Amino acid sequence: YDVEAIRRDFPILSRQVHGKTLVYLDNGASAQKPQSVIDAVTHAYANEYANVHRGLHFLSNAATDAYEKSRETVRRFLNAGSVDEIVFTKNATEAINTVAYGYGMPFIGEGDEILLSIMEHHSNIVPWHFIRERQGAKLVFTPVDDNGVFHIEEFEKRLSERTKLVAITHMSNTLGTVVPIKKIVELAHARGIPVLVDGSQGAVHLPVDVQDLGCDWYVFTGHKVYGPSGIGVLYGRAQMLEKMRPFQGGGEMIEEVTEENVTYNHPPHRFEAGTPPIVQAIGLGAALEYMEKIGRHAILAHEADLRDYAHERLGRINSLRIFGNAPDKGAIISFALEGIHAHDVSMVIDRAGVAVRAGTHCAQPLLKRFGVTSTCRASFALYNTRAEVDALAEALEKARKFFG
Amino acid sequence: AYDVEAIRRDFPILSRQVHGKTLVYLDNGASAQKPQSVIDAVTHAYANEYANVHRGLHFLSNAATDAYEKSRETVRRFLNAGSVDEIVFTKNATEAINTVAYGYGMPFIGEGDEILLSIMEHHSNIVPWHFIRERQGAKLVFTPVDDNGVFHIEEFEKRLSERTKLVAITHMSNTLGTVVPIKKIVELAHARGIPVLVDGSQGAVHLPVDVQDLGCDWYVFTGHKVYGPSGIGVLYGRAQMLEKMRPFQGGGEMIEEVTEENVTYNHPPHRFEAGTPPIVQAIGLGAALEYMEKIGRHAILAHEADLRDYAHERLGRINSLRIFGNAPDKGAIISFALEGIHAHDVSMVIDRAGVAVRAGTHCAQPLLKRFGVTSTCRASFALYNTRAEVDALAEALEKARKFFG
Numbered sequence: 001y002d003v004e005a006i007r008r009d010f011p012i013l014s015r016q017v018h019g020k021t022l023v024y025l026d027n028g029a030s031a032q033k034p035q036s037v038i039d040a041v042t043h044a045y046a047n048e049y050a051n052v053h054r055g056l057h058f059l060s061n062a063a064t065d066a067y068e069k070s071r072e073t074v075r076r077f078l079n080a081g082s083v084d085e086i087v088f089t090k091n092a093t094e095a096i097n098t099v100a101y102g103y104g105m106p107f108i109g110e111g112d113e114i115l116l117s118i119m120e121h122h123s124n125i126v127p128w129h130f131i132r133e134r135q136g137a138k139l140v141f142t143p144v145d146d147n148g149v150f151h152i153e154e155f156e157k158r159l160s161e162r163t164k165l166v167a168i169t170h171m172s173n174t175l176g177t178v179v180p181i182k183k184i185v186e187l188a189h190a191r192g193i194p195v196l197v198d199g200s201q202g203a204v205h206l207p208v209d210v211q212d213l214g215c216d217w218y219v220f221t222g223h224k225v226y227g228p229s230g231i232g233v234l235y236g237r238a239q240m241l242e243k244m245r246p247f248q249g250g251g252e253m254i255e256e257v258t259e260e261n262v263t264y265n266h267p268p269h270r271f272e273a274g275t276p277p278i279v280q281a282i283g284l285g286a287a288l289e290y291m292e293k294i295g296r297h298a299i300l301a302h303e304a305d306l307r308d309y310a311h312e313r314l315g316r317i318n319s320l321r322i323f324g325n326a327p328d329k330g331a332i333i334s335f336a337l338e339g340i341h342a343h344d345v346s347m348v349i350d351r352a353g354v355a356v357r358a359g360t361h362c363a364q365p366l367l368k369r370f371g372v373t374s375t376c377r378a379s380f381a382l383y384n385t386r387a388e389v390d391a392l393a394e395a396l397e398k399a400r401k402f403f404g
Numbered sequence: 405a406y407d408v409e410a411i412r413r414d415f416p417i418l419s420r421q422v423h424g425k426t427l428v429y430l431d432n433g434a435s436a437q438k439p440q441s442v443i444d445a446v447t448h449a450y451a452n453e454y455a456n457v458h459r460g461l462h463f464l465s466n467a468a469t470d471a472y473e474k475s476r477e478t479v480r481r482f483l484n485a486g487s488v489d490e491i492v493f494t495k496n497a498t499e500a501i502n503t504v505a506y507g508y509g510m511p512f513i514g515e516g517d518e519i520l521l522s523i524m525e526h527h528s529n530i531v532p533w534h535f536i537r538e539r540q541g542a543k544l545v546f547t548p549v550d551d552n553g554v555f556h557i558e559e560f561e562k563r564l565s566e567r568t569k570l571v572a573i574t575h576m577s578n579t580l581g582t583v584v585p586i587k588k589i590v591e592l593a594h595a596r597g598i599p600v601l602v603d604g605s606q607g608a609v610h611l612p613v614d615v616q617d618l619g620c621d622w623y624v625f626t627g628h629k630v631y632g633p634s635g636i637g638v639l640y641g642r643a644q645m646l647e648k649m650r651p652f653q654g655g656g657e658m659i660e661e662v663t664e665e666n667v668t669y670n671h672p673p674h675r676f677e678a679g680t681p682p683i684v685q686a687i688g689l690g691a692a693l694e695y696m697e698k699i700g701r702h703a704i705l706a707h708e709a710d711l712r713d714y715a716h717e718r719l720g721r722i723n724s725l726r727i728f729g730n731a732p733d734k735g736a737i738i739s740f741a742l743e744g745i746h747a748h749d750v751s752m753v754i755d756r757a758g759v760a761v762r763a764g765t766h767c768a769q770p771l772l773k774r775f776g777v778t779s780t781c782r783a784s785f786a787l788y789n790t791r792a793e794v795d796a797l798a799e800a801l802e803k804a805r806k807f808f809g
């Protein structure tokens with residue numbers, strides 16, 4: 001694992017911040033981009049740009065190819081059966097809404113249950129809440145223990161004849177806890193219940209095989225996988241996509257439009273209304289290829305080393321608490337210093353060059369359950385180093401002395 | 405004073421070859437090419453100033469939030485909206501229209517209520533309203549246009565009634581190029597308490613737009629057509645009308661409080677921007693709208709008017725050729741057919757000569773059906789196009805006619 005060589009692919013990592021060395025550990029919110037992604041975006045706009053309704057003319061063709069090729073890269077990256085199971089969206093949030101409006105709304109009604117975890121990011125909560133609020137569905141929350149460990153027996157107890165959908169995270173964006181999703185799908189499918197998986201973090205930090213998982217839907221977001229902003233992905237099993245009605249309506253998702261009626265395309269196009277994020281899809285392709293080039297398991301090993309080393313180093317800091325200590329967790333470390341506000345810690349180490357995030361992390365119910373309103377989060381990526389963990393630890397010790 | 409050769413030098417793609425031949429890109433109505441400044445702004449954002457934008461405390465989150473909030477201000481100025489809080493960023497114009505259709509239309513339009521459109525509407529300004537017809541029993545009504553493509557206000561006015569709950573209408577037809585008299589339409593609608601959505605996906609590219617002088621309740625446009633990034637749209641809505649709308653997409657950044665038991669929502673515009681938005685695309689859009697300001701919106705209008713008139717003269721001289729839409733104030737969008745030849749044939753063939761046009765429905769089937777065709781060719785002009793390109797189009801079309809004849 002040549003991390004120094006890897007870092008050289010990311011131009012931003014060498015810039016200064018307040019005249020100081022950048023140490024970017026807010027990857028969970030958004031990740032930095034390798035040169036190849038930037039080059040792919042630039043080349044698309046500069047040399048191969050047009051709209052993609054596979055037009056007859058050269059550029060429309062070249063752009064449709066580049067676009068369809070991304071769709072294939074995503075398919076391979078997730079190990080989906082077919083490219084027709086990959087739907088492009090604005091972001092993961094929109095992917096989840098597509099399912100919530102397309103499937104959930106027609107099929108989930110008064111008294112029916114939607115089963116989530118307490119770890120869900122808001123985007124895997126609010127769309128389901130719409131069904132509660134508008135149609136009288138109930139939300140149920142699978143708990144997690146004080147160590148952040150997820151217990152399958154606790155999920156299983158909350159499955160019932162009224163459960164119509166399971167929507168659950170692959171990896172917690174706060175605890176880093178990895179959810180045993182294959183086992184969850186097995187249990188759900190045995191009862192005929194479909195499962196959506198929020199893989200916005202999972203996809204960044206774990207090998208993902210959506211056929212081995214068996215999940216009905218899997219979503220992830222481009223900007224976290226080292227890729228462009230403005231691009232998300234919804235994977236859905238063909239039969240499940242097919243049963244969904246349209247979410248957004250317009251050009252490119254119809255078959256026939258007359259004054260009197262409209263008929264709809266089949267997936268994935270059924271769910272991609274108007275001009276899609278063309279160049280962002282292409283850039284995402286380049287980003288997923290970048291991850292393949294390094295090797296997904298090499299990444300996992302490297303991030304596991306950063307996780308363990310971070311737990312050791314921060315563990316040595318007197319007043320510091322880590323939220324989430326699952327053995328197989330991703331390299332996402334949420335923490336607090338006793339008697340100091342997270343925003344204080346964060347502002348201050350930013351001055352040393354260290355970028356962390358403080359606040360809710362779009363997961364308030366999780367924080368309420370853990371007895372806090374705010375935490376700091378250092379989230380690691382494939383380009384981060386042990387020396388950066390040390391810089392974090394040094395800065396946090398300094399922050400503790402400053403406010404203490 | 406319009407230096408088109410200098411302007412063209414800002415767009416790197418325009419100098420490239422296609423099938424060993426000079427590119428003549430006339431499919432701008434589908435999507436426009438990008439000036440270097442837009443590409444530079446995108447590159448710089450990713451390379452040097454990238455982070456998420458929940459105004460984080462840390463340097464990069466700050467720099468990116470600034471750049472992002474600055475784009476929002478550029479859009480506001482470009483549209484002449486009252487306030488930045490009236491600008492909602494979306495994936496594209498299509499999504500902007502759906503945000504209204506789901507946020508306003510669905511709660512407020514029911515069985516028997518009427519939604520008033522034009523026959524010229526792009527599918528994206530039809531299908532979202534059809535959902536209300538299909539799911540809640542609303543009726544769609546279509547304002548016609550005459551054979552020359554001219555829109556007649558008296559025809560819109562007759563179709564207004566006590567049952568009309570919303571008007572959704574295009575600013576400029578993506579096929580005919582017809583400009584709709586939107587100020588007058590809003591006047592008539594508002595006199596009855598009826599809100600108006602305007603589809604400005606072409607209008608914004610080709611006309612000066614002042615949404616306060618128009619008075620429209622909503623105005624949408626799309627980034628990729630205004631010389632900007634893909635993956636970015638805009639919804640403008642009068643504050644009071646945005647406020648009335650329930651949330652469309654749900655998730656991070658559009659909530660106030662989330663508990664297990666309930667969720668409360670932000671106010672506009674954030675109420676309507678769920679999850680990470682198209683950050684760098686918004687920034688790139690800003691650069692694109694500044695580009696248009698630099699050239700001058702009225703200088704553009706004069707130049708595109710010259711291209712329109714010259715194209716009508718030149719193509720008019722071609723024996724078997726019919727132009728669909730001849731309104732006197734039309735935008736520089738020319739839809740046409742050659743008698744006895746399929747549009748796909750014409751299009752594939754002139755592409756070999758280097759000329760890029762589009763054949764097909766143009767996402768406007770009802771309009772084509774009302775004009776008696778299934779398919780047309782469309783040559784759509786932009787600020788960087790020239791008279792010589794009109795000639796190239798005309799020469800290629802004459803050649804195509806002889807080839808298939």
Ligand SMILES: [Cl-]
Nearest residue numbers: 341342343374
């Ligand atoms: Cl705090």
Ligand SMILES: [Cl-]
Nearest residue numbers: 746747748779
């Ligand atoms: Cl045809």
